[PDB]
DNA sequence: CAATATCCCGAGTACATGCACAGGATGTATATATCTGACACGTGCCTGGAGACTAGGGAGTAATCCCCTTGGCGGTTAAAACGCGGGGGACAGCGCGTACGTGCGTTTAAGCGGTGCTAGAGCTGTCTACGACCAATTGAGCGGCCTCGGCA
Protein backbone atom coordinates (compact mmCIF):
# COMPACT_ATOMS: atom_id res chain seq x y z
CA UNK A 1 0.00 0.00 0.00
CA UNK A 2 2.53 2.85 -1.17
CA UNK A 3 0.04 4.81 -3.64
CA UNK A 4 0.63 3.63 -7.05
CA UNK A 5 2.66 4.51 -10.00
CA UNK A 6 1.28 3.90 -13.47
CA UNK A 7 2.91 1.92 -15.89
CA UNK A 8 2.93 4.88 -18.80
CA UNK A 9 4.77 7.28 -16.02
CA UNK A 10 7.69 4.81 -15.55
CA UNK A 11 8.04 4.06 -19.10
CA UNK A 12 8.36 7.93 -19.90
CA UNK A 13 5.16 7.61 -22.12
CA UNK A 14 1.88 9.28 -22.63
CA UNK A 15 0.10 6.31 -23.94
CA UNK A 16 -1.75 4.13 -21.95
CA UNK A 17 0.68 0.61 -21.48
CA UNK A 18 -2.28 -0.36 -19.33
CA UNK A 19 -5.02 -0.18 -22.18
CA UNK A 20 -2.76 -1.70 -24.97
CA UNK A 21 -1.80 -4.99 -23.00
CA UNK A 22 -5.11 -5.95 -22.23
CA UNK A 23 -5.69 -5.37 -25.96
CA UNK A 24 -2.99 -7.20 -27.29
CA UNK A 25 -4.00 -10.31 -24.98
CA UNK A 26 -7.43 -10.96 -26.47
CA UNK A 27 -6.13 -9.84 -29.60
CA UNK A 28 -5.57 -12.93 -32.70
CA UNK A 29 -2.35 -13.70 -30.33
CA UNK A 30 -1.47 -16.71 -29.11
CA UNK A 31 -1.44 -17.22 -25.17
CA UNK A 32 1.02 -15.01 -23.74
CA UNK A 33 1.58 -11.36 -23.72
CA UNK A 34 4.47 -10.56 -21.62
CA UNK A 35 4.27 -7.04 -20.51
CA UNK A 36 7.60 -5.60 -21.65
CA UNK A 37 5.99 -6.13 -24.93
CA UNK A 38 3.58 -3.84 -24.27
CA UNK A 39 5.79 -0.79 -23.65
CA UNK A 40 7.93 -1.76 -26.51
CA UNK A 41 4.51 -1.01 -28.32
CA UNK A 42 3.09 1.71 -26.78
CA UNK A 43 6.36 3.55 -28.15
CA UNK A 44 5.81 2.07 -31.82
CA UNK A 45 2.27 4.01 -31.95
CA UNK A 46 2.98 7.15 -29.83
CA UNK A 47 5.93 7.82 -32.20
CA UNK A 48 4.17 8.00 -35.16
CA UNK A 49 1.53 10.28 -33.55
CA UNK A 50 4.73 12.73 -33.12
CA UNK A 51 6.62 12.09 -36.59
CA UNK A 52 2.61 12.65 -38.40
C1' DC B 1 10.57 -24.92 -106.33
C1' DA B 2 14.46 -25.56 -102.16
C1' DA B 3 15.65 -25.37 -97.95
C1' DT B 4 15.51 -25.10 -92.80
C1' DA B 5 12.59 -26.36 -89.57
C1' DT B 6 8.84 -28.69 -86.65
C1' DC B 7 6.48 -32.85 -86.02
C1' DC B 8 6.25 -37.75 -85.12
C1' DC B 9 7.35 -42.55 -84.02
C1' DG B 10 9.99 -46.42 -81.93
C1' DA B 11 14.41 -48.19 -78.75
C1' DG B 12 16.44 -47.97 -75.08
C1' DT B 13 16.64 -45.82 -70.51
C1' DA B 14 17.11 -44.97 -64.14
C1' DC B 15 14.57 -44.26 -60.88
C1' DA B 16 9.91 -42.70 -58.82
C1' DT B 17 6.25 -44.14 -57.40
C1' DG B 18 3.30 -46.59 -55.50
C1' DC B 19 3.21 -50.07 -52.31
C1' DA B 20 3.91 -53.08 -47.96
C1' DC B 21 5.66 -52.84 -43.31
C1' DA B 22 6.59 -51.66 -38.20
C1' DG B 23 5.05 -48.90 -34.70
C1' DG B 24 3.95 -44.68 -32.21
C1' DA B 25 1.34 -40.62 -30.81
C1' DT B 26 -3.06 -38.99 -30.96
C1' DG B 27 -7.87 -39.20 -32.05
C1' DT B 28 -11.30 -41.32 -29.87
C1' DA B 29 -14.58 -42.18 -25.99
C1' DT B 30 -17.03 -41.20 -21.57
C1' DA B 31 -18.07 -38.36 -17.91
C1' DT B 32 -18.22 -33.80 -16.18
C1' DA B 33 -18.85 -28.69 -16.78
C1' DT B 34 -20.14 -24.00 -16.58
C1' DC B 35 -21.15 -20.85 -18.97
C1' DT B 36 -21.62 -18.68 -23.68
C1' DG B 37 -24.91 -16.69 -25.44
C1' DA B 38 -29.62 -18.09 -27.13
C1' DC B 39 -33.58 -16.43 -26.38
C1' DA B 40 -36.59 -14.12 -24.76
C1' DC B 41 -38.21 -9.59 -23.28
C1' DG B 42 -39.11 -4.66 -23.79
C1' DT B 43 -36.70 0.74 -25.09
C1' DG B 44 -36.46 4.35 -27.69
C1' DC B 45 -34.32 6.16 -32.35
C1' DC B 46 -33.69 6.81 -36.76
C1' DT B 47 -34.65 5.24 -40.80
C1' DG B 48 -37.95 6.51 -43.23
C1' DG B 49 -41.54 8.87 -44.94
C1' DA B 50 -43.88 13.04 -47.00
C1' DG B 51 -44.32 18.73 -48.51
C1' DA B 52 -43.11 23.23 -50.19
C1' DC B 53 -39.91 25.87 -52.25
C1' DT B 54 -36.17 28.02 -54.38
C1' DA B 55 -31.87 28.18 -57.21
C1' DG B 56 -28.33 25.31 -59.05
C1' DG B 57 -27.58 22.48 -62.08
C1' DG B 58 -28.50 19.97 -65.96
C1' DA B 59 -29.73 19.54 -70.57
C1' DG B 60 -30.00 21.44 -74.62
C1' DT B 61 -28.18 23.90 -78.62
C1' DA B 62 -24.82 26.50 -81.88
C1' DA B 63 -20.69 27.49 -83.81
C1' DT B 64 -16.20 25.83 -84.78
C1' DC B 65 -11.10 24.38 -85.28
C1' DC B 66 -8.41 21.92 -82.12
C1' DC B 67 -6.82 17.99 -81.87
C1' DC B 68 -6.93 13.99 -83.61
C1' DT B 69 -6.07 11.47 -87.45
C1' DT B 70 -3.66 10.06 -91.79
C1' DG B 71 -0.24 9.87 -95.28
C1' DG B 72 3.84 10.17 -96.55
C1' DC B 73 7.93 11.37 -94.77
C1' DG B 74 13.55 10.36 -94.21
C1' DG B 75 16.87 8.03 -91.07
C1' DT B 76 18.83 4.51 -88.48
C1' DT B 77 19.09 0.54 -86.03
C1' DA B 78 17.43 -4.73 -83.65
C1' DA B 79 17.60 -8.72 -86.12
C1' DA B 80 20.23 -12.38 -88.72
C1' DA B 81 23.85 -15.08 -88.88
C1' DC B 82 28.15 -16.06 -88.25
C1' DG B 83 32.38 -16.50 -86.14
C1' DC B 84 34.59 -17.10 -81.55
C1' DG B 85 35.85 -17.10 -75.52
C1' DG B 86 35.51 -18.35 -71.60
C1' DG B 87 32.57 -20.00 -68.33
C1' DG B 88 28.81 -22.71 -66.34
C1' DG B 89 29.04 -27.56 -65.42
C1' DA B 90 30.22 -32.31 -62.92
C1' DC B 91 33.21 -34.45 -58.51
C1' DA B 92 36.38 -35.19 -53.86
C1' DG B 93 35.98 -33.55 -48.54
C1' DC B 94 35.45 -30.11 -43.23
C1' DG B 95 33.35 -28.81 -39.85
C1' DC B 96 30.46 -25.72 -38.60
C1' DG B 97 25.28 -25.07 -37.25
C1' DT B 98 21.29 -26.87 -36.45
C1' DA B 99 19.03 -29.53 -34.10
C1' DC B 100 17.73 -31.54 -29.76
C1' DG B 101 17.96 -32.80 -25.13
C1' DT B 102 18.68 -31.14 -20.06
C1' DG B 103 17.80 -28.66 -16.76
C1' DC B 104 17.88 -24.55 -16.96
C1' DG B 105 14.33 -20.59 -13.00
C1' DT B 106 11.57 -15.62 -15.27
C1' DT B 107 7.53 -14.32 -15.60
C1' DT B 108 2.34 -14.37 -16.23
C1' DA B 109 -2.14 -15.29 -14.97
C1' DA B 110 -5.30 -15.16 -11.34
C1' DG B 111 -7.59 -13.67 -7.76
C1' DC B 112 -7.12 -10.38 -4.21
C1' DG B 113 -9.02 -4.89 -2.61
C1' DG B 114 -8.61 -0.35 -3.34
C1' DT B 115 -9.35 4.22 -6.17
C1' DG B 116 -8.60 7.65 -9.57
C1' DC B 117 -8.63 8.03 -14.67
C1' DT B 118 -11.64 8.74 -18.42
C1' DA B 119 -15.25 9.58 -20.80
C1' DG B 120 -19.92 11.28 -21.19
C1' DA B 121 -22.12 14.83 -19.47
C1' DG B 122 -23.05 21.08 -20.44
C1' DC B 123 -25.49 25.23 -23.28
C1' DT B 124 -20.65 24.78 -20.89
C1' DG B 125 -19.11 29.66 -23.32
C1' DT B 126 -17.52 31.80 -26.69
C1' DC B 127 -14.97 33.14 -31.20
C1' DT B 128 -11.79 30.45 -35.00
C1' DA B 129 -13.19 30.11 -38.95
C1' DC B 130 -16.72 31.33 -42.28
C1' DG B 131 -18.71 33.81 -45.37
C1' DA B 132 -19.17 38.90 -47.28
C1' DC B 133 -17.61 42.35 -48.89
C1' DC B 134 -14.07 45.75 -50.22
C1' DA B 135 -9.79 47.18 -52.36
C1' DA B 136 -4.84 46.60 -55.42
C1' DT B 137 -2.37 44.93 -58.72
C1' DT B 138 -0.77 43.40 -62.88
C1' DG B 139 -1.37 42.80 -67.74
C1' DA B 140 -3.23 43.43 -72.23
C1' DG B 141 -5.10 45.82 -75.89
C1' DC B 142 -6.42 50.42 -78.31
C1' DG B 143 -5.75 55.12 -79.02
C1' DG B 144 -2.66 58.48 -80.10
C1' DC B 145 1.52 61.42 -80.81
C1' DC B 146 6.14 61.12 -83.46
C1' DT B 147 11.69 59.01 -88.32
C1' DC B 148 12.52 56.99 -91.90
C1' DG B 149 12.52 53.91 -97.02
C1' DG B 150 10.84 53.12 -101.06
C1' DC B 151 8.44 55.75 -104.99
C1' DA B 152 6.98 60.43 -108.37
Known sequence: ????????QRAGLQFPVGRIH????????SHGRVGATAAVYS???LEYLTAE
Open 43 to 45: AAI
Open 22 to 29: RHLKSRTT
Open 1 to 8: KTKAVSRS
